[PDB]
Amino acid sequence: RDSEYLLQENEPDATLDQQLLEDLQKKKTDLRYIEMQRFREKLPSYGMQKELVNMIDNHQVTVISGETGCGKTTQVTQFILDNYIERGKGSACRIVCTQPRRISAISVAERVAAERAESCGNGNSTGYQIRLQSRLPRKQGSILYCTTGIILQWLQSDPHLSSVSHIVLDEIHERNLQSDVLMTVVKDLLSYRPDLKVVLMSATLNAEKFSEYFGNCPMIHIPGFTFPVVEYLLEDIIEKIRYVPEYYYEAIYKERWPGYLRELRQRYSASTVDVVEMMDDEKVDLNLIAALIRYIVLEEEDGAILVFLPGWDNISTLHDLLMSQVMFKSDKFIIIPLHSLMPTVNQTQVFKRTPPGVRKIVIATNIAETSITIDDVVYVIDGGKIKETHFDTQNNISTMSAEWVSKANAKQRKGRAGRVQPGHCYHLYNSLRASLLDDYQLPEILRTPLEELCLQIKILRLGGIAHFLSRLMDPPSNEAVLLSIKHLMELNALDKQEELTPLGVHLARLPVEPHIGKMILFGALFCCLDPVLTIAASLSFKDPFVIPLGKEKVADARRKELAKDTKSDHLTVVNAFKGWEKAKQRGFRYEKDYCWEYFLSSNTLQMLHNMKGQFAEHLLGAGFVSSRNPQDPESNINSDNEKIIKAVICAGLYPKVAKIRLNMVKVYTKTDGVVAIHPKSVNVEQTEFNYNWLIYHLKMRTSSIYLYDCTEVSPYCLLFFGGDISIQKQETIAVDEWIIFQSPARIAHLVKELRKELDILLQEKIESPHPVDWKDTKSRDCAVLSAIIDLIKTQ
Numbered sequence: 199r200d201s202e203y204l205l206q207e208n209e210p211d212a213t214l215d216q217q218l219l220e221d222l223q224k225k226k227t228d229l230r231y232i233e234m235q236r237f238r239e240k241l242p243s244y245g246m247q248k249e250l251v252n253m254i255d256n257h258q259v260t261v262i263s264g265e266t267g268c269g270k271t272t273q274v275t276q277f278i279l280d281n282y283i284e285r286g287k288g289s290a291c292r293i294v295c296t297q298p299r300r301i302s303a304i305s306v307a308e309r310v311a312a313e314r315a316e317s318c319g320n321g322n323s324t325g326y327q328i329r330l331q332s333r334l335p336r337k338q339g340s341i342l343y344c345t346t347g348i349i350l351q352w353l354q355s356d357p358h359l360s361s362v363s364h365i366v367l368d369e370i371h372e373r374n375l376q377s378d379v380l381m382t383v384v385k386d387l388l389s390y391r392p393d394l395k396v397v398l399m400s401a402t403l404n405a406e407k408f409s410e411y412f413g414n415c416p417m418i419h420i421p422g423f424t425f426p427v428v429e430y431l432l433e434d435i436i437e438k439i440r441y442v443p444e445y446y447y448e449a450i451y452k453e454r455w456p457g458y459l460r461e462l463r464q465r466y467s468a469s470t471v472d473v474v475e476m477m478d479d480e481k482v483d484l485n486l487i488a489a490l491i492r493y494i495v496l497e498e499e500d501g502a503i504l505v506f507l508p509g510w511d512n513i514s515t516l517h518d519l520l521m522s523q524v525m526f527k528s529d530k531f532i533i534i535p536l537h538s539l540m541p542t543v544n545q546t547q548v549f550k551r552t553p554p555g556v557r558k559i560v561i562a563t564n565i566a567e568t569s570i571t572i573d574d575v576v577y578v579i580d581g582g583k584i585k586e587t588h589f590d591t592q593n594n595i596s597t598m599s600a601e602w603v604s605k606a607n608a609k610q611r612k613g614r615a616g617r618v619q620p621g622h623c624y625h626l627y628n629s630l631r632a633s634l635l636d637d638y639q640l641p642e643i644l645r646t647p648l649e650e651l652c653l654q655i656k657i658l659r660l661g662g663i664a665h666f667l668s669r670l671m672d673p674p675s676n677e678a679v680l681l682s683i684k685h686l687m688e689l690n691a692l693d694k695q696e697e698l699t700p701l702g703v704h705l706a707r708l709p710v711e712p713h714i715g716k717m718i719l720f721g722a723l724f725c726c727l728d729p730v731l732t733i734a735a736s737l738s739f740k741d742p743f744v745i746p747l748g749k750e751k752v753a754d755a756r757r758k759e760l761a762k763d764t765k766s767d768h769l770t771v772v773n774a775f776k777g778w779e780k781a782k783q784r785g786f787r788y789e790k791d792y793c794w795e796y797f798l799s800s801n802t803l804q805m806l807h808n809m810k811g812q813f814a815e816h817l818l819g820a821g822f823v824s825s826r827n828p829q830d831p832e833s834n835i836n837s838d839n840e841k842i843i844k845a846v847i848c849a850g851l852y853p854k855v856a857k858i859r860l861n862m863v864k865v866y867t868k869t870d871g872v873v874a875i876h877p878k879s880v881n882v883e884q885t886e887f888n889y890n891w892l893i894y895h896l897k898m899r900t901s902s903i904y905l906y907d908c909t910e911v912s913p914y915c916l917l918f919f920g921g922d923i924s925i926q927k928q929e930t931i932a933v934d935e936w937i938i939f940q941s942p943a944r945i946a947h948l949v950k951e952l953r954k955e956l957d958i959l960l961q962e963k964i965e966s967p968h969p970v971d972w973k974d975t976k977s978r979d980c981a982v983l984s985a986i987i988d989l990i991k992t993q
């Protein structure tokens with residue numbers, strides 16, 4: 199797949215060493231190369247060139263620290279390569295550098311290539327590799343930037359990374375789940391790769407923690423700053439622009455709050471102290487950010503502005519807040535949102551230069567807080583908050599919320615300025631808030647569901663999940679991991695013996711949560727891709743329905759209208775999405791009339807459309823579809839069948855099942871007991887159900903359990919995609935004991951055999967995956983899927 203660079207053989211030779219040495223000497227007479235070197239010599243890392251190379255050359259593992267923008271990411275790789283080339287051994291270099299995000303790997307590779315007077319990829323010295331996109335460099339004497347997900351995928355093809363000579367783990371402070379896994383895998387690999395060199399780099403790092411973890415490996419600090427960046431706290435921001443607004447650590451904040459205000463009145467005007475007193479800790483003040491942006495463009499010198507917001511809802515709100523003003527309507531401004539859910543083509547536009555009279559304003563999430571360098575950025579506005587997932591071990595409920603930024607994230611955000619020229623960073627938290635921020639975010643492995651952790655451990659054949667936990671830098675609790683094992687068994691991704699099923703193999707290859715991965719996989723298998731990807735896109739992110747202040751009743755009636763007779767919150771989103779695409783074909787004014795009439799968010803709908811393309815790419819790289827288009831005819835033969843779609847929904851949401859009792863309707867969920875239906879759902883006032891079963895995705899606990907989104911489902915969908923099957927008594931079938939319904943006992947025998955055929959189908963798909971040819975009709979794989987579909991259609 200994406201392992202072309204990996205599965206090459208590292209074959210150094212002296213003749214290619216001489217060609218690289220001569221080419222390097224020829225570069226030193228090229229004007230463009232010479233001018234780039236003038237810029238490189240200004241970086242603090244350039245002064246450490248001999249010291250950095252000598253340490254990497256004498257030690258297997260090296261921890262490199264340095265100030266933001268000191269040059270690690272773009273220079274250290276070049277220092278290793280150019281040192282080898284100058285020593286006459288350049289062909290022995292196969293340097294791989296990991297980046298946490300795709301926008302980092304692309305832009306850094308393009309920048310390094312330009313610093314070497316070369317294009318990126320094209321068999322030159324530098325290139326990049328990401329999911330389904332690559333610019334690959336030459337075989338020997340080369341640098342490859344990639345994502346950590348790429349390296350994890352490589353470990354499935356070569357657990358030893360045999361052809362790589364240097365692996366550079368960058369931004370290691372970003373303790374994301376995959377990075378911690380990769381870091382532990384690299385540590386185990388050292389003894390099996392005595393020839394491999396490992397470099398660990400971060401600008402904001404407890405470097406002794408990583409040194410100690412890697413056997414007290416040597417540390418080296420790159421001293422110096424590139425350009426000064428002035429910092430401002432909330433009181434300083436309010437003082438400068440004269441702005442007037444139109445768990446235990448919080449107890450400390452409240453205790454020190456009155457004394458802090460007193461000490462503040464001695465250093466700031468009373469107006470600003472009163473404003474600090476009434477500022478809101480719950481959400482980011484978008485009006486203040488807009489007012490600060492107005493002040494910068496009207497009173498400060500030229501330079502792009504970069505704004506950090508928690509999520510997409512804040513970005514679009516601020517964007518509309520600016521665009522509603524006459525000043526920002528003109529072509530003197532180019533306002534660019536930046537979100538990880540945007541297509542990579544859209545993310546790269548942030549790096550395009552602006553005309554001299556044009557001010558660039560980038561509104562980004564934490565996607566932009568590390569690695570990347572934006573040329574004209576001079577002003578950084580730090581909203582002070584960051585989206586974080588959190589996990590509670592009392593119920594299967596994980597929450598994503600906007601938390602206070604840590605000091606490391608703040609330093610990384612400040613570091614986006616001061617790279618090519620001086621800059622200013624504005625932090626929207628007061629000084630008392632600053633003293634109570636944490637140094638780093640809690641590692642993601644300690645606060646998220648761990649289903650992907652267990653799938654990753656199993657697909658990489660790393661051994662027992664207990665032994666691997668003991669090797670992690672920060673191991674999660676056993677109960678959290680055991681809870682993930684149980685969830686993966688209920689999804690039938692693991693069998694009773696904690697071993698990957700055929701389905702579990704494909705789910706581990708899909709870079710999404712297995713509930714979503716199982717849904718889009720069977721949407722591709724059952725040829726109903728487009729409606730399922732729309733449902734999957736809305737289960738991730740959010741649904742596109744909004745409720746203005748009112749008068750929720752008229753918005754309710756619109757939602758039930760879009761549901762038709764489906765009794766499905768998820769088919770409602772599909773109908774709302776399909777009507778939106780058709781409204782767009784009519785015209786822009788009529789598209790707005792559609793969104794206003796049905797209380798739909800065009801911004802959310804466009805975001806959902808982007809995510810559908812990303813899901814199809816995942817299925818394309820996994821071999822289950824033939825193109826990146828979610829509406830490919832080859833994947834949508836059954837896209838108009840509500841029963842088949844609802845089965846795929848059930849395939850994804852099981853075991854989140856609810857039972858309906860009548861006479862007056864009551865709902866039960868085995869784990870929570872009696873639940874209720876969220877008033878936003880279309881099934882709140884429903885008393886007529888064709889079936890007594892619902893599937894759901896989101897649960898909200900407010901002293902009462904509400905199912906946010908649910909669809910009625912036939913017991914035969916639960917029978918096939920459920921758990922254990924038992925026949926009771928006096929002729930009933932049971933699914934996981936509690937799901938009981940009267941049915942001929944031989945149906946249970948049929949489902950056991952069809953499940954087995956489905957496993958055989960997925961097993962044959964493991965080696966070389968190709969999409970099911972739904973035009974063959976007379977094929978084994980199509981006959982199996984048709985038999986399952988026939989069972990779903992009729993009892």
Ligand SMILES: Nc1ncnc2c1ncn2[C@@H]1O[C@H](COP(=O)(O)OP(=O)(O)O)[C@@H](O)[C@H]1O
Pocket residue numbers: 241264265266267268269270271272273309401424569570571573617618
């Ligand atoms: N696309 C670019 N345009 C202009 N200058 C750049 C670009 N990319 C990097 N630089 C310069 O090269 C330096 C290298 O940055 P980087 O290697 O990312 O440093 P670090 O990894 O320490 O943050 C930056 O400080 C910046 O000044």
Ligand code: ALF
Pocket residue numbers: 264265266267268270271369400401567568569570613614
């Ligand atoms: F150290 Al950086 F972007 F990686 F400032």
